[PDB]
Amino acid sequence: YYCYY
Amino acid sequence: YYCYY
Amino acid sequence: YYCYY
Amino acid sequence: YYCYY
Amino acid sequence: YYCYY
Amino acid sequence: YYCYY
Amino acid sequence: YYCYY
Amino acid sequence: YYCYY
Amino acid sequence: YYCYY
Amino acid sequence: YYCYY
Amino acid sequence: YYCYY
Amino acid sequence: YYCYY
Ligand SMILES: O=C(O)[C@H]1O[C@@H](O)[C@H](O)[C@@H](O)[C@@H]1O
Ligand SMILES: O=C(O)[C@H]1O[C@@H](O)[C@H](O)[C@@H](O)[C@@H]1O
Ligand SMILES: O=C(O)[C@H]1O[C@@H](O)[C@H](O)[C@@H](O)[C@@H]1O
Ligand SMILES: O=C(O)[C@H]1O[C@@H](O)[C@H](O)[C@@H](O)[C@@H]1O
Ligand SMILES: O=C(O)[C@H]1O[C@@H](O)[C@H](O)[C@@H](O)[C@@H]1O
Ligand SMILES: O=C(O)[C@H]1O[C@@H](O)[C@H](O)[C@@H](O)[C@@H]1O
Ligand SMILES: O=C(O)[C@H]1O[C@@H](O)[C@H](O)[C@@H](O)[C@@H]1O
Ligand SMILES: O=C(O)[C@H]1O[C@@H](O)[C@H](O)[C@@H](O)[C@@H]1O
Ligand SMILES: O=C(O)[C@H]1O[C@@H](O)[C@H](O)[C@@H](O)[C@@H]1O
Ligand SMILES: O=C(O)[C@H]1O[C@@H](O)[C@H](O)[C@@H](O)[C@@H]1O
Ligand SMILES: O=C(O)[C@H]1O[C@@H](O)[C@H](O)[C@@H](O)[C@@H]1O
Ligand SMILES: O=C(O)[C@H]1O[C@@H](O)[C@H](O)[C@@H](O)[C@@H]1O
Secondary structure: OEEEO | OEEEO | OEEEO | OEEEO | OEEEO | OEEEO | OEEEO | OEEEO | OEEEO | OEEEO | OEEEO | OEEEO
């Protein structure tokens, strides 16, 4: 799960 | 904002 | 599953 | 908002 | 259990 | 995608 | 328990 | 992704 | 890679 | 949603 | 590596 | 969300 804000 | 679950 | 808001 | 499941 | 994709 | 368990 | 992905 | 337990 | 939604 | 990489 | 969201 | 590496 990786988020790039 | 993009998330890769 | 990847979402691009 | 587009999601690619 | 109900999922709404 | 939202699930309600 | 409800999750909103 | 937010879950409300 | 297998996902079970 | 469970993924097994 | 297995994740259970 | 629990991951078992
Ligand atoms: O675009 C970025 O700044 C960063 O994005 C992340 O996903 C990459 O792992 C990192 O190496 C990049 O520096
Ligand atoms: O359009 C964007 O900003 C981003 O969209 C994501 O899906 C791509 O993985 C990333 O490389 C892009 O920078
Ligand atoms: O790395 C991936 O498998 C995917 O990552 C997503 O962000 C991109 O939009 C998609 O084109 C790629 O196929
Ligand atoms: O990468 C893909 O297979 C698909 O991704 C979707 O977002 C595009 O609308 C579609 O035209 C592509 O064929
Ligand atoms: O919100 C919706 O569009 C739909 O959501 C589903 O869960 C309901 O069973 C269906 O009757 C609704 O039309
Ligand atoms: O905020 C949303 O888009 C959705 O969030 C879900 O939890 C609700 O069951 C659905 O009726 C909403 O349309
Ligand atoms: O039924 C429930 O407990 C919950 O279901 C979720 O989808 C709604 O977003 C939340 O407002 C409700 O409190
Ligand atoms: O229902 C709740 O207690 C909480 O649910 C969260 O999603 C809301 O962000 C928060 O403002 C509420 O206080
Ligand atoms: O557990 C399940 O319902 C399903 O899980 C999938 O991964 C299997 O390919 C399918 O044969 C099963 O019926
Ligand atoms: O605990 C669960 O509901 C699920 O957890 C997953 O990791 C298992 O592959 C699946 O067979 C189970 O049904
Ligand atoms: O195959 C595996 O290593 C693992 O796959 C997961 O889905 C099961 O929940 C876990 O008990 C197994 O040890
Ligand atoms: O398999 C393991 O080592 C561990 O996996 C975790 O998910 C269990 O909560 C923990 O009790 C086990 O000891």
